[PDB]
Design a protein around this ligand. Structure first.
Ligand code: FRW
Ligand code: CA
Length: 240
């Protein structure tokens, strides 16, 4: 997150860290959202890769023992069947991960609230991106979980030529584009939390940014629209 602030440790309890094995160690690669005690929602591009993964729930600081983490294996990966490798603009950038165990819930570990199917946010709706991604274009991961306020940019504006044009589809959410705040590498797969009728729900799965940088004016961060995939999600869970 470029232009982030440190999240309180109990603000975003559905955020997870998706990590890959690196020798003797584990490295954060993507975010995700805990959606069942044994299921995580992330981006397809995070997991359509030759890596071995684990999930950390109750994670705040990637570099320090928080005393709240649960570390769990990834047992099954279900990428959306219409995802195309290395092709974010074609959409379908979503995957579900069945965890090797069911995590226990607490103020640091909660299921993400998902929107009802079909729900679309009014332009300029209040949302926060969260994650440990780069804090500057070509920078480094955050240590502590970051948040940034990214108001939505509706499809009509976002798909206009001054914004993303035809790159953006109606199965995506755009948010931000102020030139200061954005997602950046390592935020991918995490939640976009939007406040509607007094409740935060996870409306987006972080997907991609501009070829010119992370924080680029009129190039909002782009997310998979969760509410377009409710039936898909439910079918995967029910079949696995
Ligand atoms: C995420 O944390 C990360 N996402 C990305 O880096 C994604 C994954 C593929 C590359 N990518 C990008 O965001 C890149 N953009 C594009 O590849 C792209 C831009 C424009 C168009 C188009 O048609 O208009 C098509 C593709 C940029 C250049 C890095 C963050 C940024 C959410 C992780 F991948 F894990 F790093
Ligand atoms: Ca930690």
């Amino acid at each position: 997150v470029v232009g982030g602030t440190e999240a309180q440790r109990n603000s975003w309890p559905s955020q997870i860290s998706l990590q890959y094995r690196s020798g003797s160690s584990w490295a954060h690669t993507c975010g995700g959202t805990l959606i069942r005690q044994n299921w995580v929602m992330t981006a397809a591009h995070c997991v359509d890769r030759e890596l071995t993964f684990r999930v950390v729930v109750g994670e705040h600081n990637l570099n320090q023992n928080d005393g709240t983490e649960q570390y769990v294996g990834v047992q099954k990966i279900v990428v959306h069947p219409y995802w195309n490798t290395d092709d974010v603009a074609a959409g379908y950038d979503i995957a579900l991960l069945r965890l090797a165990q069911s995590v226990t819930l607490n103020s640091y570990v909660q299921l993400g609230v998902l929107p009802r199917a079909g729900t679309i946010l009014a332009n300029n709706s209040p949302c926060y991106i969260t994650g440990w991604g780069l804090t500057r274009t070509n920078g480094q991961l955050a240590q502590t979980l970051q948040q940034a306020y990214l108001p939505t940019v509706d499809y009509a504006i976002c798909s206009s030529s001054s914004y993303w044009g035809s790159t953006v589809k109606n199965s995506m959410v755009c948010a931000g584009g102020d030139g200061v705040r954005s997602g950046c590498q390592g935020d991918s797969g995490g939640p976009l939390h939007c406040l509607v009728n007094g409740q935060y729900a996870v409306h987006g799965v972080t997907s991609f940014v501009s070829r010119l940088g992370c924080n680029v004016t009129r190039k909002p961060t782009v997310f998979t629209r969760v509410s377009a995939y409710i039936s898909w999600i439910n079918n995967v869970i029910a079949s696995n």
